[PDB]
Amino acid sequence: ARVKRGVVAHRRHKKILARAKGYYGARSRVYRVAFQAVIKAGQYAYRDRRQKKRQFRALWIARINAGARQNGLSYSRMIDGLKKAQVIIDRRVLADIAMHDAVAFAALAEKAKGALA
Amino acid sequence: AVQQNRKSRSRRDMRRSHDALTENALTVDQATGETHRRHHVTKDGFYRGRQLFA
Amino acid sequence: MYAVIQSGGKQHRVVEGETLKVELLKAESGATITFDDVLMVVNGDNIQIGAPVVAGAKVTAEVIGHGRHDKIRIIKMRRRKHYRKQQGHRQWFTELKITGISG
Amino acid sequence: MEVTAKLRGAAISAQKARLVADLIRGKSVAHALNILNFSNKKAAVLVKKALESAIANAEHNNSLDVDDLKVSTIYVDEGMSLKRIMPRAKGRADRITKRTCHITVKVGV
Amino acid sequence: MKTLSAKPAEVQHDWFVVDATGKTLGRLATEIARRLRGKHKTSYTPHVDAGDYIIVINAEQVQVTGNKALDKKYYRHTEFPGGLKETNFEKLVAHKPEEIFERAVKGMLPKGPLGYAMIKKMKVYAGSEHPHAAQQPQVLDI
RNA sequence: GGGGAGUGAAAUAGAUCCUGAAACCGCAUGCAUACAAGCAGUGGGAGCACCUUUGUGGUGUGACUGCGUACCUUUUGUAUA
RNA sequence: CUAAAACUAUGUGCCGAAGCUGCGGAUGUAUACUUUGUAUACGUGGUAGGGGAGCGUUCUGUAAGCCGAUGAAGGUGUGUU
Numbered sequence: 001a002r003v004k005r006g007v008v009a010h011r012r013h014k015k016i017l018a019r020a021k022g023y024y025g026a027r028s029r030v031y032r033v034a035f036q037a038v039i040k041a042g043q044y045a046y047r048d049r050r051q052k053k054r055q056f057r058a059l060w061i062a063r064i065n066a067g068a069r070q071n072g073l074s075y076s077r078m079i080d081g082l083k084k085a086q087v088i089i090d091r092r093v094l095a096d097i098a099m100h101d102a103v104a105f106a107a108l109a110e111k112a113k114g115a116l117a
Numbered sequence: 118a119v120q121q122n123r124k125s126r127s128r129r130d131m132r133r134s135h136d137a138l139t140e141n142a143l144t145v146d147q148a149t150g151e152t153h154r155r156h157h158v159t160k161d162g163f164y165r166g167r168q169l170f171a
Numbered sequence: 172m173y174a175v176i177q178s179g180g181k182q183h184r185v186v187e188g189e190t191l192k193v194e195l196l197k198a199e200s201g202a203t204i205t206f207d208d209v210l211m212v213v214n215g216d217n218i219q220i221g222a223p224v225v226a227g228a229k230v231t232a233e234v235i236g237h238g239r240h241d242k243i244r245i246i247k248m249r250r251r252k253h254y255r256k257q258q259g260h261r262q263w264f265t266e267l268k269i270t271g272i273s274g
Numbered sequence: 275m276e277v278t279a280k281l282r283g284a285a286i287s288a289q290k291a292r293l294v295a296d297l298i299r300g301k302s303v304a305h306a307l308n309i310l311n312f313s314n315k316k317a318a319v320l321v322k323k324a325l326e327s328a329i330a331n332a333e334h335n336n337s338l339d340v341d342d343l344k345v346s347t348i349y350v351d352e353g354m355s356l357k358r359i360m361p362r363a364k365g366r367a368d369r370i371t372k373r374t375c376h377i378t379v380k381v382g383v
Numbered sequence: 384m385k386t387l388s389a390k391p392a393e394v395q396h397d398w399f400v401v402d403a404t405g406k407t408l409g410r411l412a413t414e415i416a417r418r419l420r421g422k423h424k425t426s427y428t429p430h431v432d433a434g435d436y437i438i439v440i441n442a443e444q445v446q447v448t449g450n451k452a453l454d455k456k457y458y459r460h461t462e463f464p465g466g467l468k469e470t471n472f473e474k475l476v477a478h479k480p481e482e483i484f485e486r487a488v489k490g491m492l493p494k495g496p497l498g499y500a501m502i503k504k505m506k507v508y509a510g511s512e513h514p515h516a517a518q519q520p521q522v523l524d525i
Numbered sequence: 526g527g528g529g530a531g532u533g534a535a536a537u538a539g540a541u542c543c544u545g546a547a548a549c550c551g552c553a554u555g556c557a558u559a560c561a562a563g564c565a566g567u568g569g570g571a572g573c574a575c576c577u578u579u580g581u582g583g584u585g586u587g588a589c590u591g592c593g594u595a596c597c598u599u600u601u602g603u604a605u606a
Numbered sequence: 607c608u609a610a611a612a613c614u615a616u617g618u619g620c621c622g623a624a625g626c627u628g629c630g631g632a633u634g635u636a637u638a639c640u641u642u643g644u645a646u647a648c649g650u651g652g653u654a655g656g657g658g659a660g661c662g663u664u665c666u667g668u669a670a671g672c673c674g675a676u677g678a679a680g681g682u683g684u685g686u687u
């Protein structure tokens with residue numbers, strides 16, 4: 001039962017090289033280099049699934065800060081005031097309202113201010 | 118004495134970006150009608166109204 | 172008409188006719204669900220903010236179907252330690268369409 | 275419609291012939307013939323042979339007019355090498371590859 | 384829904400003039416850089432230049448506290464074997480007040496193509512007059 | 526050496542002649558690229574081009590941006606120069 | 607950076623991890639009743655190393671069967687599980 005390694009080996013190399021399209025030089029042509037390139041890409045993607053949620057929350061907090069400082073507060077005091085008024089809108093929606101609807105955001109800032117005083 | 122890394126195919130084509138050829142100065146001798154290299158005797162021995170080796 | 176609703180542990184800002192994906196639901200494809208824990212309603216310089224809920228506000232939606240997102244590939248590796256591991260993932264979702272916002 | 279001519283097995287390397295092929299790509303047939311006539315390069319003779327053959331094919335088998343023709347396509351490919359041995363100093367031996375090319379011309383109006 | 388980025392084609396930079404007479408240098412530089420980057424706008428996007436233009440006038444009337452007018456050193460290297468060059472704050476302010484704001488503000492910005500493109504919107508003039516009267520700047524009381 | 530003609534079911538079955546992969550090397554089209562510093566990806570993300578529908582679609586490219594020093598072996602311990 | 611953007615003392619907020627909570631999914635062990643089906647609970651970082659369960663490859667029987675010139679194996683793309 002002599003077994004030849006021609007078809008399965010060729011298909012494995014082919015599948016690894018099909019996942020390396022767009023890479024530069026030997027990284028999309030040479031199996032040894034493309035294999036390390038695909039593994040490192042998977043590692044990077046695993047770590048950036050975690051980092052994406054931090055980056056987006058930082059962006060929401062910055063936009064809410066910009067919106068609150070036009071209404072007379074800092075981010076800290078608006079978030080504290082909204083928590084003291086039992087408003088539970090999260091930051092993803094607050095940043096949306098800051099970026100698209102200035103009147104409703106002024107209403108929210110007034111509610112927070114009233115809660116603080 | 119020798120390289121430590123092979124040269125990418127891009128840096129090898131970047132060096133050859135000065136390797137192109139140019140044309141020569143060719144004119145029409147309407148004394149005879151033919152094309153010839155400017156300032157040179159034609160293939161059959163004509164130049165500016167004279168013939169060598171008739 | 173821009174209401175704010177809760178679903179699947181997250182919050183959404185919706186209008187009428189909008190189609191959106193949320194986490195998997197138990198409801199049946201073709202049924203009708205109703206969100207009656209509404210956080211804010213804006214109808215144009217008329218703004219109802221819930222503390223934490225707007226009292227008599229309704230948002231109705233229809234279940235179009237259930238599906239899966241595209242495949243994600245998880246790769247764990249430890250260099251120089253003889254350790255590699257790989258996994259696949261597709262996440263489930265329910266697709267809703269917003270029918271009415273009461274206010 | 276393009277009319278083709280092939281010159282397979284030229285005894286020159288493709289890198290040397292590509293320089294002459296770059297000079298006439300896309301030009302009128304008479305202008306390219308002039309360029310090739312007044313060149314001091316060795317690849318110019320082979321490229322002129324292939325171009326003359328393509329013009330003759332276009333006018334004989336396809337019956338086209340010549341003053342309207344153009345060098346629409348031209349490219350050079352590599353052929354098969356000849357392997358030889360060169361004795362070096364102190365008993366060492368080097369390998370010499372003698373290279374070949376294929377010229378392809380396509381003439382069209 | 385999702386968080387949208389600002390489109391560069393929809394961005395609108397505005398023009399402001401700020402007077403520097405009798406002002407601490409760094410406490411002005413932080414405001415200038417915050418306006419140059421666009422952090423005061425609710426459309427702020429870290430990969431988009433949504434900032435504003437600033438004009439500084441009377442750049443030679445800016446101040447430092449303590450003993451820094453004589454003791455703060457500015458350095459340079461020409462990249463020749465001994466080419467380190469040194470100057471003062473007070474020698475440099477009576478001779479090139481544009482470079483003091485250049486350094487103070489550029490140190491407070493990102494370091495890459497977008498940071499190079501933001502510093503272009505700062506215009507520093509030593510005297511009371513600027514040439515950009517056609518742009519209609521506003522008086523920003525920083 | 527080729528282009529027609531002709532044979533043959535087939536001529537990129539034409540004698541280096543069944544099938545005809547990869548490394549490597551060209552020609553053509555689309556997009557990007559000559560003020561900007563590093564394992565070349567990854568998370569975002571504008572614009573353009575082509576398909577298509579009246580799209581919160583598909584395909585290619587990727588300005589700008591956060592993070593990020595190959596693999597194996599041997600070691601107390603390696604981006605390791 | 608100088609009545610600080612330093613130091614000491616006090617207070618009120620906020621940011622901040624793959625920690626914890628929320629929502630969806632997989633899996634190990636033990637238990638409870640059907641009597642094999644789900645709940646409940648605790649768990650699920652790993653080198654040397656031990657245990658368990660699988661994919662694919664060539665060949666023999668099943669096979670004088672089943673698919674194939676209305677196109678097999680092989681090669682090259684696309685879509686999907």
Ligand SMILES: [Mg+2]
Nearest residue numbers: 126127130551
């Ligand atoms: Mg090239």
Ligand SMILES: [Mg+2]
Nearest residue numbers: 361363364365
């Ligand atoms: Mg000898």
Ligand SMILES: [Mg+2]
Nearest residue numbers: 535537538545
């Ligand atoms: Mg064929």
Ligand SMILES: [Mg+2]
Nearest residue numbers: 542543544545
């Ligand atoms: Mg063959």
Ligand SMILES: [Mg+2]
Nearest residue numbers: 558559560561
């Ligand atoms: Mg440029």
Ligand SMILES: [Mg+2]
Nearest residue numbers: 561562563565
């Ligand atoms: Mg460099």
Ligand SMILES: [Mg+2]
Nearest residue numbers: 599600602603
């Ligand atoms: Mg050692």
Ligand SMILES: [Mg+2]
Nearest residue numbers: 599600601602
């Ligand atoms: Mg040692």
Ligand SMILES: [Mg+2]
Nearest residue numbers: 594603604605
């Ligand atoms: Mg280390």
Ligand SMILES: [Mg+2]
Nearest residue numbers: 121604605606
């Ligand atoms: Mg080195």
Ligand SMILES: [Mg+2]
Nearest residue numbers: 079620621622
């Ligand atoms: Mg907190």
Ligand SMILES: [Mg+2]
Nearest residue numbers: 050053054623
């Ligand atoms: Mg977290």
Ligand SMILES: [Mg+2]
Nearest residue numbers: 624625626627
């Ligand atoms: Mg955990």
Ligand SMILES: [Mg+2]
Nearest residue numbers: 628629630631
């Ligand atoms: Mg769970």
Ligand SMILES: [Mg+2]
Nearest residue numbers: 256650651652
């Ligand atoms: Mg484990």
Ligand SMILES: [Mg+2]
Nearest residue numbers: 624649650651
């Ligand atoms: Mg654990």
